[PDB]
Design a protein around this ligand. Structure first.
Ligand SMILES: [Mg+2]
Ligand SMILES: [Zn+2]
Lengths: 52, 202, 163, 190
RNA sequence: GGUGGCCAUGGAAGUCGGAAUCCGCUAAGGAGUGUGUAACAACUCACCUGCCGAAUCAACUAGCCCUGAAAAUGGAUGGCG
């Protein structure tokens, strides 16, 4: 259907990401602070939910 | 931890540098924790394997003891995953030979060393045609009933030449197992001597 | 086995645990023993007779596969004999006081215990196993009037008799 | 706190010739020539190394947030050397479940045409920046190769087509479709 | 590794949870940070190594700027700026 290494490529671009608990912005997996000025670089971060 | 224990490990290495004059420098680039549990008990009657870290550059402080000059030739070999195996009874090679067990093949691409690798003209035994690894390089092959054969032979890669990725994956599928001097031995020390594993020192 | 389903003298090992009487609630080995000419009932009820006569607290079970014969030996585990070195069995159904009773003293019986530990420990000559299997205690907790907390420190026996 | 001085030297190889017009470096080697101004960054570009061996950037009496600008110029220059000696080669692979992503280039690069993404009728067209030669690869099934010299021109063209193939109103945790940058490499390896 | 350790079996062999609970190989591996897996595995993290050459790390505290910060005729540091 979709080959494994090809899949975990697009996963790298769509899935493994931290997300701001404040402003829902999408960040890379090493993030400890957010980007946005609107939330205030919160650090209330949480992984993107892995689809079941 | 590691203010008194660090000063403890210094006392265990300085003891094996004086008590045991026979030193075996081994390299363990690939190893498992259960693998050494068996090597220490398959050589328990003879040897004592001592594994350390960067601090193995402490032979200076045993040489700083105003006593031993010849430990300066042990300087250029404390680098790249080096640990020591001191033994009392080691007479000569006769023990060093019985240590070489089943250890690296696996022939990675980008390697150089051992010798002129040959593939004797024997029936491979792989599945049907499967000749894309023979045809990409070029060797006369024929399909006898079922399996593949090689109806000629020459040396694939010579000494000093690089091994490509396709000619390395084909040697691992044929079960031919060259290109390795891993967890066996690197450089021996015995009474200020300089051994060299270009073949006289065994 | 290798190329085309060729058995050749079958002698294959498979290990199992959790021995009650035997089992037989429409359940045994399978996924390993259906394919391999072994049954689910006969080779199960024969696992009783050998894993019985006071084996009824959780055991380890190696069963050697000959053509359709299952050799049901009981290989002793390190903490299963120390459970069998207990004040001997209250089995099931009242026992009701579950499994942490714990005073059995195993003085020279751990010595026999660390003797019948076949080849498993890659061992220093019992100067340390007398503490390895002496520190794996939650039930017994020592020779008649002590704790295993203070046997870890000493030990004044067996060192030069085991080698 | 203002730091009195920070600097960093670039090791220019022997293939290339870098010659700075005050603050605008120009870099010419085998493949071509590149240029980049820096009349926003307020540093001293010296060419101290002789015969030609060192591009040395100073900053000077600057504080925390400008001392950071020292190395980012340093890297923008090595990327310029690595682009005119070897050249960048971004590879991107097409991923999909059912509808095959149907790529075809149309001038030399300069027009990447994508049919049948998620079955969509609307044919997506994507220009390339000047100097970027897009090309459909071989020795792989669903794979483009973007070549050129400017890392800046090549990698945003890659993003231009990576961002053109995005799904709307779906769970992109499941619908993992599109053309994604798979390998940031070079043209010649040496 | 001793190790399907013990409790718990509904599965917890390190890992829903808990009493815990230490040795061997030791270099170093917590009877385990987690990913998850019915459980493993597989992966990973502590811990320890291989490479590199000198400053690095953590918790607090305060100054300024940002977030918190949404109202209705257009709009007010007095204005320009
Ligand atoms: Mg919807
Ligand atoms: Zn945010």
């Amino acid at each position: 259907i979709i080959e494994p290494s090809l899949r975990q490529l697009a996963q790298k671009y769509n899935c493994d990401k931290m997300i701001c608990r404040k402003c829902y912005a999408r960040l890379h997996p090493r993030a400890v602070n957010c980007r946005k000025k609107k939330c205030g670089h919160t650090n209330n971060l949480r992984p993107k939910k892995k689809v079941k | 931890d590691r203010a008194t224990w660090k000063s403890n490990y210094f006392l265990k290495i300085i003891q094996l540098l004086d008590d045991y004059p026979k030193c075996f420098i081994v390299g363990a680039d690939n190893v498992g924790s259960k693998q050494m549990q068996q090597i220490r008990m398959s050589l328990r009657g003879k040897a004592v394997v001592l594994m350390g870290k960067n601090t193995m550059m402490r032979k200076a402080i045993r040489g700083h003891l105003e006593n031993n000059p010849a430990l300066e030739k042990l300087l250029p070999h404390i680098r790249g995953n080096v640990g020591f195996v001191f033994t009392k009874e080691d007479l000569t090679e006769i023990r060093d030979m019985l240590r070489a067990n089943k250890v690296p093949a696996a022939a990675r691409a980008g390697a150089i060393a051992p010798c002129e690798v040959t593939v004797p003209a024997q029936n491979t035994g792989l599945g049907p045609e499967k000749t894309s690894f023979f045809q990409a390089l070029g060797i006369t092959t024929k399909i006898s009933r079922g399996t593949i054969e090689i109806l000629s032979d020459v040396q694939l890669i010579k000494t000093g030449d690089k091994v490509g990725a396709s000619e390395a994956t084909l040697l691992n599928m044929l079960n031919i197992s060259p290109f390795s001097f891993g967890l066996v031995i690197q450089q021996v020390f015995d009474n200020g001597s300089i051994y060299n594993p270009e073949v006289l020192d065994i | 086995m290798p190329p085309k389903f060729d058995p050749n003298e079958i002698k294959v090992v498979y290990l199992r645990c959790t021995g009650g009487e035997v089992g037989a609630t429409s359940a045994l080995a399978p996924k390993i023993g259906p394919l391999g000419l072994s049954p689910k009932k006969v080779g199960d009820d024969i696992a009783k007779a050998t894993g019985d006569w006071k084996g009824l607290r959780i055991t380890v079970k190696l069963t050697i596969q000959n053509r359709q014969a299952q050799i049901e030996v009981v290989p002793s585990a390190s903490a299963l004999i120390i459970k069998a070195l207990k004040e001997p069995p209250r089995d099931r159904k009242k026992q009701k006081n579950i499994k942490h009773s714990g005073n059995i003293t195993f003085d020279e019986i751990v010595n026999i215990a660390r003797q019948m530990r076949h080849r498993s420990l890659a061992r220093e000559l019992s100067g340390t196993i007398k503490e390895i299997l002496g520190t794996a205690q939650s039930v017994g907790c020592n020779v008649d009037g002590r704790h295993p907390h203070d046997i870890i420190d000493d030990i004044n026996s067996g060192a030069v008799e085991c080698p | 706190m203002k730091t009195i001085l920070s600097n960093q030297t670039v090791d220019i190889p022997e293939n290339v010739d870098i010659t700075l017009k005050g603050r605008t470096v120009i870099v010419k080697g085998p493949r071509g020539t590149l240029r980049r101004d820096f009349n926003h960054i307020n540093v001293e570009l010296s060419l101290l190394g002789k015969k030609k061996k060192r591009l040395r950037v100073d900053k000077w009496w600057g504080n925390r947030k400008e001392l950071a600008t020292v190395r980012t110029i340093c890297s923008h220059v090595q990327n310029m050397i690595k682009g005119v000696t070897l050249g960048f080669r971004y590879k991107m692979r097409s991923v999909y479940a059912h509808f095959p992503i149907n790529v075809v280039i149309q001038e030399n690069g300069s027009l990447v045409e994508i049919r049948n993404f998620l079955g969509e009728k609307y044919i997506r067209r994507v220009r390339m920046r000047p100097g970027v030669a897009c090309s459909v690869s071989q020795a792989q099934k669903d794979e483009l190769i973007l070549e050129g010299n400017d890392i800046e021109l090549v990698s945003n063209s890659a993003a231009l087509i990576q961002q053109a193939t995005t799904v709307k109103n779906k769970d992109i945790r499941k619908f993992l479709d599109g053309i994604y940058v798979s390998e940031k490499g070079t043209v010649q390896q040496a």
